[PDB]
RNA sequence: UGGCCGUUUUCGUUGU
């Protein structure tokens, strides 16, 4: 029964139309993929030494937000569950940065690109930092001046966007339905009239305005959701969608297993 | 055993709690200790 | 009653997180020409209280 | 200084089973479910469908306090079906609906590019 | 000998950042410890427009 | 302290005897007290700090 | 201080775009334009790059103790 | 007990691989204080990593 | 091998 109609696809942003599914389901999918998509991001920042004007905590934080290519994270076990003593390369991807400036003039600009992967459960395409392009320098982590050296020994792990907002693969989920308010679920504030004040949505042409003589439908329901996804780049939007669906599926499957096992 | 660093010339040295508190190399009277060696951690959160 | 709800993720993204510096103070004290106080790691046998 | 562990919002302690059922003796064929480590994301989805079923008399839940990660679901199917079966039936229904949606999206993305 | 330490305020935590060690006006040792930490907004803060 | 135990409670100034009451205990995280939004009037209190 | 990593509101990484914004401003393009060419539509992001203040250059202008 | 005031890590548990210091060692449940957070957590003696002359040594030091 | 000690008085600034 469920349908799908992608309107504009891309690496990051997906602008589709989902219809013929319970609004509860669309909302829960949005929520789960905003919150319950396992990913990879910096977890333990071990600073061998620092000489910058930025507090060590400040850098550890800035690293916490750096998006990590996590296309194979699904293979990586949870560091909580992995049986290895301390961390292992099958439950942890080690990245190290060691940048420096020399000379009495100018200012260096350490970027995300300078990050480097030391190990990782290869060849799983995990650990690499994301970039818009190849020459796109990217995220700015700091600025260095004469004699100032920065050295760090980062660590990442597999956590979920619940435990922090760095594990969020989703950036901004658009979401709406009934662009003409057929179901009337919203009452429109106004000073003179509803129609001559409120500008129309961008999906205005996608559903025909109600006819002037049209009367209310008390059995009507929400049917067509237009949800435009976007990502930081840590995972492809299609991967986001499929992984969210898979996670929700396995979660319900776990619940059903619990139900049956209880007896 | 207890290194230091000048605030004017930024050259490292040490003292044994008996030398007067002065920079050995430039004579400046403001110094700082240097970072320990045990390992520093952050959760990046 | 003038209370606010904050987007947890907005906090986690570096919203209104600030720094806090505290400076301690101390100095060696003199009770006379031959009596002073020395910064040092005190052993328990040599010191009391 | 007394904040809960952010890893505890989803991880479960060993001694507590993921789900806990409590029959509702004050009316017939009614049960109350004591969930663990769950919120609106799961509850709303389960409730919508279990309401859509024909042989369900009353179904509801509530989030006690957003500072705690568990909720309670009230379910009362007609005498025709025991509630456990209705809940697992809805579980299967959403499972298959999601599978269908995934397959359609996969095909659509393949063709689109 | 008697202890004359300068314990950290029991209600504070963080990391020592920058130790200073110079003479006072009168030529005794005269120290300063700038401990630091970052304050995460949480339940019970204050804000204003 | 365990849940449901009795403990006093107060605000300053304690103008009228409806500024002191005996409540019941509920253990919770975070480091603030919380009151049902109704009982603010007898304490003449608000959460602006 | 420094351009942040992720927009607090949404989460759309912006920090990497700061330099490009300065560059575009250089040739005199009006700010709204520059924010456009970066593809920043939701003003939840426009607020930052429009109204962030760079201090790290100021903080570095002091000679480090090293 | 000669096993106090030493740097210690966690090998298993919800804080796998966090540097911690032994603040209190009453018995059979070591109270260790971490660095990344501003808190101290109890933990069984066998779920920790103890620094030694070389490498990280489990509970045999 | 338990047992175990951290100023006052001013003034200020603020808070509800
Ligand atoms: Mg007030
Ligand atoms: Zn491992
Ligand atoms: Zn010098
Ligand atoms: Zn934004």
Question: Where are chain G's structural domains?
Answer: 1-66
The DSSP H or E segment spanning D102 is helix D83-112
- Interior/surface letters B15-39, b for 16+ CB within 10 angstroms, e for the rest: beeeeebbbbeeebeebbbeeeeee
Q: To 10 degrees, the CA torsion angle through A41, D3, H21, E16?
A: 80
A119 is in an annotated binding site: no
Whole-angstrom Cα distance, residue C12 to residue H58?
34
Q: Does the beta carbon of E3 lie under 8 angstroms from any beta carbon of chain C?
A: yes
Which one, of H32, A135, C40, E11, lies nearest residue F31 by Cα? E11
Whole-angstrom Cα distance, residue A148 to residue A138?
21
- Catalytic residue flag (residue C2): yes
Query: Do residues E20 and E31 touch, judged by C-beta distance below 8 A?
Result: yes
| C-alpha distance from H58 to closest chain A C-alpha (Å) | 9
Q: To 10 degrees, the CA torsion angle through C32, C34, C40, C43?
A: -110
Residue ranges of chain G whose CB lies within 8 Å of a chain A CB: 2-3, 5-6, 10-13, 15-16, 18-19, 42, 44, 56-57, 59-60, 62-64, 66
Residues A88 and A198 in one domain: no
Which one, of C31, C43, C34, lies nearest residue E3 by Cα? C43
Question: Where are chain D's structural domains?
Answer: 1-113
Residues A64 and A158 in one domain: yes
Pair of tokens at residue G25 = 């401003």
Residues A157 and A189 in one domain: no
Q: How far is the CA of A261 from the centre of ligand 4 (A)?
A: 45
Query: Do residues B21 and B5 touch, judged by C-beta distance below 8 A?
Result: no
E49: helix, strand or coil: coil
A79 is in an annotated binding site: yes
Note the Cα H59 to chain centre separation in Å.
Answer: 9
Residues A58 and A132 in one domain: yes
Which one, of A75, A85, A64, A34, lies nearest residue A156 by Cα? A64
Whole-angstrom Cα distance, residue H25 to residue H48?
13
Note the Cα A183 to chain centre separation in Å.
Answer: 31
Residues A140 and A157 in one domain: yes
Which one, of B14, B33, B32, lies nearest residue B24 by Cα? B14
Q: Beta H30-34 vs H40-43: how paired, if at all? A: antiparallel
The CATH architecture that domain G1-66 belongs to is: Orthogonal Bundle (1.10)
Whole-angstrom Cα distance, residue G32 to residue B39?
47
Pick one of 3.40.640.10, 3.40.50.920, 3.40.50.300, 2.20.28.30 as the CATH number of B1-45. 2.20.28.30
Kindly write down the DSSP assignment for every residue of C11-39, as one continuous string: HHTTSS-EEEEEEEEEE--BSSSS-B---
Which one, of A83, G46, A29, E47, lies nearest residue C5 by Cα? E47
Query: Do residues A113 and A137 touch, judged by C-beta distance below 8 A?
Result: yes
Counted across chains B and G, CB pairs separated by less than 8 A come out at 7
Whole-angstrom Cα distance, residue A42 to residue H36?
13
Residue in the block written with tokens 């070591």: H30
- Looking at the 3D structure of chain A, how many domains does it have? 2
Contact A80 D95 (CB under 8 A): no
Query: Do residues A88 and A117 touch, judged by C-beta distance below 8 A?
Result: no
Q: What is the domain range of residue A209?
A: 1-38+166-263
Residues A112 and A183 in one domain: no
Whole-angstrom Cα distance, residue D5 to residue C11?
16
The nt closest to F45 (CA vs C1′) is I16
Partnered with residue A17 across adjacent β-strands are A5
Q: To 10 degrees, the CA torsion angle through H39, H41, H46, H52?
A: 20
Query: Do residues B27 and B41 touch, judged by C-beta distance below 8 A?
Result: no
Could you give the angle at the alpha carbon of A94 between the alpha carbons of A90 and A98, nearest 5°? 170
Positive or negative, the CA dihedral A39, A45, A46, A48 is positive
Q: Which burial class, exposed, middle or buried, applies to A57 when counting CB atoms under 10 A from its CB (0-12, 13-18, 19+)?
A: buried
What was the resolution (in A) of this experimentally determined structure? 4.1
H25: helix, strand or coil: coil
Partnered with residue A156 across adjacent β-strands are A42
User: CB of residue E5 closer than 7 A to nucleic acid strand I?
Assistant: yes
Q: What's the CA C47/C1' I3 distance, rounded, in angstroms?
A: 17
Residues A236 and A153 in one domain: no
D32: helix, strand or coil: strand
Q: Does the beta carbon of B45 lie under 8 angstroms from any beta carbon of chain C?
A: yes
CATH class, domain D1-113, is: alpha beta
Partnered with residue E23 across adjacent β-strands are E29
Contacts of D96 (CB under 8 A, 6+ apart): none
Nearest CA in chain F to E48: F48
The DSSP H or E segment spanning B32 is strand B31-33
3-state secondary structure chain A: CCCCEEEECCCCCEEEEEECCCHHHHHHHHHHHHHCCCEEEECCEEEEEECCCCCHHHHHHHHHCCCEEECCHHHCCCCCCCCCCCCCCCCCCEEEEEEECCCCCCCECCEHHHCEECCCCCCCCEEEECCCCCCCCCCECCCECCCCEEEEEEEEEEECCCCCHHHCCECCCCCCECCCCCCCCCCCCCCCCCCCCCCCCCCHHHCCCCCCCCCCCCCCCCCEECCEECECCCCCHHHHHHHHHHHHHHHHHHHHHHHHHHC
Cα separation values, G44 from C18, G20, G51, Å: 21, 19, 12
Helices D40-52/A237-262 angle, 10° precision: 70
Counted across chains B and C, CB pairs separated by less than 8 A come out at 4
Report which of residues 2-41 in chain F place their beta carbon less than 7 angstroms from any atom of strand I. 12
Half-sphere exposure of F9 (CA within 13 A, CB side): 17
Note the Cα A263 to chain centre separation in Å.
Answer: 39
C–H contact: 3+ Cβ pairs < 8 A: no
Residue A90's region, left for phi above 0, alpha for psi from -120 to 50, else beta, is: alpha
Whole-angstrom Cα distance, residue A41 to residue A159?
8
């Amino acid at each position: 029964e469920p349908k799908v109609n992608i309107i504009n696809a891309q690496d990051d942003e997906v602008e589709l139309m989902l219809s013929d599914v319970n609004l509860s389901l669309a909302n829960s999918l949005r929520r789960t993929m905003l919150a319950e998509v396992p990913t990879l991001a910096i977890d333990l920042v071990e600073i061998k030494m620092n000489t910058s004007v930025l507090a060590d905590e400040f850098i550890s934080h800035r690293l916490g937000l750096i998006p990590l290519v996590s296309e194979d994270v699904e293979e990586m076990k949870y560091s909580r569950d992995c049986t290895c003593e301390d961390y292992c390369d099958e439950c942890s991807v080690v990245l190290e940065l060691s940048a420096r400036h020399e000379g009495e003039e100018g200012t260096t600009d350490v970027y995300s690109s300078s990050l480097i992967k030391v190990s990782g459960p290869g060849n799983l395409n995990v650990g690499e930092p994301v970039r818009r392009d190849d020459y796109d320098q990217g995220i700015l982590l700091c600025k260095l001046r004469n004699h100032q050296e920065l050295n760090i020994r980062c660590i990442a792990k597999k956590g979920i966007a619940k435990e922090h907002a760095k594990w969020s693969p989703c950036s901004a989920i658009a979401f709406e339905y009934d662009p003409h308010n057929k179901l009337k679920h919203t009452d429109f504030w106004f000073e003179v009239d509803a129609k001559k004040e409120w500008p129309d949505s961008k999906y205005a042409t996608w559903e025909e305005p109600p006819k002037p003589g049209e009367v209310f439908d008390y059995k009507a329901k929400p049917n067509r959701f237009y949800m435009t996804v976007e990502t930081t780049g840590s995972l492809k939007a299609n991967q986001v969608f499929s992984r969210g669906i898979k996670t929700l599926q396995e979660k319900l499957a776990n619940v059903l297993f619990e139900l049956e096992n209880s007896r | 055993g207890v290194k230091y660093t000048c605030g004017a010339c930024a050259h490292n040295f040490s003292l044994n709690k008996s030398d007067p508190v002065r920079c050995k190399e430039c004579g400046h009277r403001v110094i700082y200790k240097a970072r320990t060696k045990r390992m520093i951690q952050f959760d990046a959160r | 009653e003038d209370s606010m709800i904050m987007n947890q993720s907005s906090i986690d993204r570096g919203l209104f997180r600030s720094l806090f510096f505290r400076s301690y103070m101390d100095q060696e004290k003199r009770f006379g020409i031959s009596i002073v106080e020395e910064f040092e790691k005190p052993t328990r046998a040599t010191t009391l209280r | 200084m007394n904040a809960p562990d952010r890893f505890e919002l989803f991880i479960l302690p060993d001694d507590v089973p993921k789900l806990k059922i409590t029959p509702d003796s004050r009316v017939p064929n009614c049960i109350i479910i004591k969930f663990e480590r769950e919120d609106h994301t799961l509850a709303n989805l389960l409730r919508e469908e279990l309401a859509l079923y024909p042989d369900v008399t009353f179904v509801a839940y509530k989030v006690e306090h957003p500072l705690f990660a568990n909720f309670v679901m009230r379910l009362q199917t007609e005498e025709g079906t025991r509630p456990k079966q209705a809940l697992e039936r809805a579980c299967a229904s959403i499972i298959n609906k999601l599978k269908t949606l995934d397959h359609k999206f996969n095909e659509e993305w393949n063709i689109k590019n | 000998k008697r202890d004359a330490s300068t314990p950290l305020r029991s209600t504070e935590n963080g990391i020592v950042d920058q130790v200073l060690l110079t003479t006072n006006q009168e030529g005794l040792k005269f120290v300063k410890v700038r401990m630091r930490t970052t304050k995460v907004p949480q339940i019970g803060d204050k804000f204003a427009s | 302290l365990m849940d449901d135990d009795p403990v006093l409670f107060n605000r300053q100034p304690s103008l009228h005897k409806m500024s002191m009451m005996a409540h019941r205990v509920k253990v919770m995280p975070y480091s603030t007290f919380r009151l049902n939004l109704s009982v603010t009037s007898p304490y003449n209190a608000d959460f602006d700090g | 201080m420094i351009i942040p990593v992720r927009c607090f509101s949404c989460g759309k990484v912006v920090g990497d775009k700061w330099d490009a914004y300065l560059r575009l401003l250089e040739e005199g393009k009006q700010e709204g334009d520059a924010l456009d060419e970066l593809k920043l539509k939701r003003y939840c992001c426009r607020r930052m790059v429009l109204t962030h203040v760079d201090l790290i250059e100021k903080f570095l202008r002091y000679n480090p103790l090293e | 007990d000669p096993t106090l005031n030493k740097t210690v890590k966690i090998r298993q548990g919800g804080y796998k691989g966090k540097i911690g210091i032994v603040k209190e060692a009453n018995g059979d449940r070591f109270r260790v204080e971490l660095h990344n957070p501003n808190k101290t957590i109890p933990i069984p003696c066998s779920f920790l990593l103890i620094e030694s002359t070389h490498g990280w040594v489990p509970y045999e030091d």
